[PDB]
Structure 1
């Protein structure tokens, strides 16, 4: 399938134990997709002071469309030193590994895989 319905655990930035997916734009996008597939991916909602607490490169989920079965359609965009790789809509949050942190909510998304 080109798209997959996922329910992403929303984590508080100060709870996150593993604060990025790796060391290159290509690696973080790769790892993010693997974790999304394995159900081991969390979402941090971006506000003032969140991103500097996480590790670059960042992986964003961004709205790709204006929501089948409650699931907002999203795609992945990476960022490193203020350059983005991809072009998409509004940020829903930054993806991080989920290693058992207790979430505050779930974000239902339809991921272009």
Structure 2
């Protein structure tokens, strides 16, 4: 399928144990997609002081359209030293590995896979 319904656990930035997916734009997009498939991907909502507490390159989910069955359609954009790889709508959050942190909420998304 081109799209897959996911419910992403929303984590508080200070709980996050693994603060990014890797060391290149290509690796973080790769790892993010693998974790999203495996159900091991969390979401941190971007506010003041969040991103400096996470590791670059960043992987964002961005709104790709205006929401089947409550799932906002999203796609991945990476960022490294202020350059983004991909073009999409508004950021819903930054993706991180999920390794058992307790979420505060779930974000239903339809991921362009």
TM bracket, shorter-chain basis: over 0.9
Measured against aligned partners, the alpha-carbon deviations of 1:4-48 in whole angstroms (never above 9, x if no partner) come to 000000000000000000000000000000000000000000000
TM-score normalised by the chain length of structure 2: 1.00
Structure 1 unpaired stretches of 5+: none
Instruction: Return 5+ residue gaps in structure 2 as ranges.
Output: none
Which consecutive segments of 4 or more residues in structure 1 shift more than 2 A? none
Q: Distance in 2 between matches of 1:30 and 1:51?
A: 20
| CA–CA separation in structure 1 for the residues paired with 2:83 and 2:29 | 14
* CA-CA distance at 1:106 after TM superposition: 0.1
Give aligned pairs, total.
113
Structure-1-length-normalised TM-score: 1.00
1:49-74 residue CA offsets vs partner (Å, 9 max, x unmatched): 00000000000000000100000000
Match of 2:76, SS?
strand
